[PDB]
């Protein structure tokens, strides 16, 4: 549907998405809203890392709130 992301700056974007997507494209959408390159994004929800699967795979659902932290090369 339309999931949200609580980022490490406290920013709480709204992200137009779909379960037909995969979190790589999510990172691109995050690269869209605030321009954080995918390779320094690390996405958490259910206390667990999201390996580069779809939202409709990780038991993610509509109108949800992931936590975007900083992956740190």
């Amino acid at each position: 549907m339309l999931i949200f992301v609580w980022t490490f700056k406290g920013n709480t974007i709204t992200l137009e998405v779909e379960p037909s997507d995969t979190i790589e494209n999510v990172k691109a959408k995050i690269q869209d809203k605030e321009g954080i390159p995918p390779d320094q994004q690390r996405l958490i929800f259910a206390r667990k890392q999201l390996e580069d699967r779809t939202l409709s795979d990780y038991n993610i659902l509509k109108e949800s709130t992931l936590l975007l932290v900083r992956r740190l090369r």
Partner: protein, 374 residues
Amino acid sequence: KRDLVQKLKILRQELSQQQPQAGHCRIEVSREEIFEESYRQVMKMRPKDLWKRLMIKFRGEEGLDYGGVAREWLYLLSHEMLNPYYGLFQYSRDDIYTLQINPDSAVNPEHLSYFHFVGRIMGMAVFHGHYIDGGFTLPFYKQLLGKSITLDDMELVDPDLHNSLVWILENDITGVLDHTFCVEHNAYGEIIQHELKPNGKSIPVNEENKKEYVRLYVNWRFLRGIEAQFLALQKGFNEVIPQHLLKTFDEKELELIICGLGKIDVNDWKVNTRLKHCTPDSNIVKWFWKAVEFFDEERRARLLQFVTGSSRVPLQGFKALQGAAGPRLFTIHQIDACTNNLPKAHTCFNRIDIPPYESYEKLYEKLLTAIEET
């Protein structure tokens, strides 16, 4: 179980010495305007007046008993002031038996006085040993006790926030998370930012102050949008019950003394039931308890609603059920009527009238139809 029995004796002791020996708390309200007239009369009163012996009258009515009228007044009153119709409270998302403060309450410009009013009414129910006709979340009772909200309490109010905050506590945020002691939320189509502490906008969240951050942010997410309303209610409540009288109570105990017993035991029910024109071994009576045994908790709440006006019972349970004049046990009355009728209730008498239905299934189905929700 015992410890609660001792805590309640101690509370009753101390409430007793807080009550003045002389004087009365006098209320005279019409039944059609119980809410607004109770509000004007109670808010004229000083805290100290609220501890006096209750002396309530319904306009144009002589009561059977001052204690009884008082019992009725709080039940009828609390049913009005909590009804979401008047804008102060609303049903919680997943449960209609649980009320929450309405964030949008200020459309009533005088709304804080009404929350203050509600606090005093809840406190008077505790102080004088009556019950409120409604129910709140456990975190609400917890905030009413002055306790802080655990993080565990988030697992229902916000699983997604609960998990994020958990992850912050479990892992090292150094270099990974640039959060601040200030939080933002969606208020009226808009984003508004709120410091969790003085100058929190300028205070980084780090590994050292993480625990403080999550504690302040849980406490805030419960009060979010309802803070002034809770404060006003809590003032009214502590004007009647000083906060130190409830030091030793937890949230589940406060809920029992304010609202009574929510868990309905069928055996306590069976045993404190009177039978009119039927016997313990008659079919209508066996089938009724068979149906009550199958009824889940929601269904049992509605059946009790239907026959008594309340989905809750006193702490002492069903032996303590009150009717109009003093106590009246639950009563099953088998009546001589057409077997297509539904059971009819007489809530002044805690009596249900049942036709001599021909099968368990007919009674089961007709009972469920009678107790349908309004």
